Structure formats: C-alpha cells, structure tokens
Ligand binder design. Sequence first.
Ligand code: O38
Ligand code: MG
Ligand code: MG
Ligand code: MG
Length: 272
Amino acid sequence: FQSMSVKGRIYSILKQIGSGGSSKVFQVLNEKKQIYAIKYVNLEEADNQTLDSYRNEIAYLNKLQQHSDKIIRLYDYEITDQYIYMVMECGNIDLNSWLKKKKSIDPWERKSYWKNMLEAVHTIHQHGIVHSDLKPANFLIVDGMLKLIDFGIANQMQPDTTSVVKDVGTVNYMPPEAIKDMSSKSKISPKSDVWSLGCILYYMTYGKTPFQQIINQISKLHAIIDPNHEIEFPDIPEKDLQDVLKCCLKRDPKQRISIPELLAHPYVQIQT
Ligand SMILES: Cn1cc(-c2ccc(Nc3ccc(C#N)c(NC4CCCCC4)n3)cc2OCC#N)cn1
Ligand SMILES: [Mg+2]
Ligand SMILES: [Mg+2]
Ligand SMILES: [Mg+2]
C-alpha cells in the first residue's frame, strides 16, 4: 500500500485511475475518508517544453475555477523540481468509459451533457484557449454533470487496467483542418473544438463516431478531409439535434457553426 502528502495533508491511495507518460491519476482518501483524484507528475526527466506545458495547464485550471462549474475542481496543488501533485474532485466516471458501457442514452441526458460541454468549451475559448484534441475522455461525469478535466495543453492519459496489456490514442474526433495543417498560417481556431464536440454528440446520437467503421488509419484520415465523402445523418425524431450535427460536422471551418451560435440553437434553448 502507498500514501502521499500534499501541502501538509495526507492521502492514502485506493487505486490508479489512469497514467500517461510521466503522469498518473490516483483515486485517494483524505483523513476524513473523503474521496479525491490526485494527478502525480514525475518531473525528473522532463524537458523545458514538457515542464512549461504542465505549468500552463495548472495556471489555466486554477484561473478558470471561478469562471465555470463545468470545469473540474482543483482543490490544491504542490509543485517542486521533482514532481507535481494536483488534488481534484474524483467524479463518478469519465465520458469515454460511460459511453462504452451505455447501450441507449436518454434524449434528456444527451441534451444536458451537450449543454455542459458547450459551456466548458465556451469558457476556455473566452480565455483564448483552443483544446484542439477534444475526446470523451477529456470529460468527467460528476453527479450527472459533465466537467472538462484538461485543456489539451499537457500530455493525455489513458485509463488503467488490472490485467496484462496487449498493445494507443483515437483519431475519430480529429478536425479536417488539423490534418490539412500538417503539410503547411496558424490554421487552428475555436471551430476545431466545434468539430470534435460534433463527433462526441454524433456518438451520443448514432452509437458510433462519424468514421468509426473505417478500421484502417490512412483511409480514415482521407475520409475526414474528403468533401466527396458524405457523412450519414439518419432521420431521428429530434430534428434540432439532426441540424446541430450537420452544422458541427461541416468540413469548411468558416461555414461550420460557432460556440456562441450553438448556445442560441433551438436544440439547447427550446423545451428548456
Ligand atoms: C468505471 N470507470 C470509472 C472511471 C473514472 C475515471 C476518471 C475519474 N476521475 C478523474 C479525475 C481526474 C482526472 C485527471 N486528471 C482523471 N483523469 C482520467 C485519466 C484517464 C482517462 C480518463 C480521465 N480522472 C474517476 C473514475 O471513476 C471513479 C473513480 N476512481 C473510469 N472507468
Ligand atoms: Mg477498465
Ligand atoms: Mg481487461
Ligand atoms: Mg478486466
């Protein structure tokens, strides 16, 4: 068994939630037997670019605490030359693990989750942050409410397993312009997050991502950028939801709907 100290407060580790690179997230208990998640970053072999990404993520997470409750709570942190400890709320489950377990999603829960994500992403955009790598794993379900966990500034972590692993990230939420930018101008804009949000909502509507069927990677990337590749939008009773999806998944970012527009859309506004 293991334990840890953060700004003079002791926590006992229950299990490891996730890990990625020099980072680990643990489910812990304080002295009062209250649950938290602690992200541990080992900085021993970290370069100045990796260091600055962890510093920038902490500064933005702390700054944005007061601006939205759709951003994960950061209670405390410790930073030295050797490590980082971040004390956060634990939550119930990340949105990716939740979507993989769920068979059918209630239209009211899908709508409520959509509103939470728009608000979180809108808040970061207002502070000049574009995530550019949004996936369901970036969102935490905390008592039926979605909260953005990270800002895409530091390295991404994957959930851990207690079994021996056999062989990775996802390409299913990647904007078409993120692919086109690699050969070449900034390219990136708040619209890149709209596309990724659109892929998440598409998953919550049709049970798959827009290009989940394409197993091959080079053929998937081609399909995301190809204008002749028609994305299927099967008819559903929620006509407003069908329009949101079509407007989020436009290949030209200039034609793609914005976050302020999505917040005034009937899907989010009509019937509360
Ligand atoms: C059945 N299941 C539950 C989870 C889960 C997943 C995440 C969290 N809480 C947090 C709280 C903070 C962070 C950070 N930073 C974080 N990161 C994970 C890393 C792996 C990918 C998902 C996000 N996860 C709590 C979670 O469950 C409650 C606990 N412990 C995953 N599968
Ligand atoms: Mg598992
Ligand atoms: Mg397993
Ligand atoms: Mg297992």
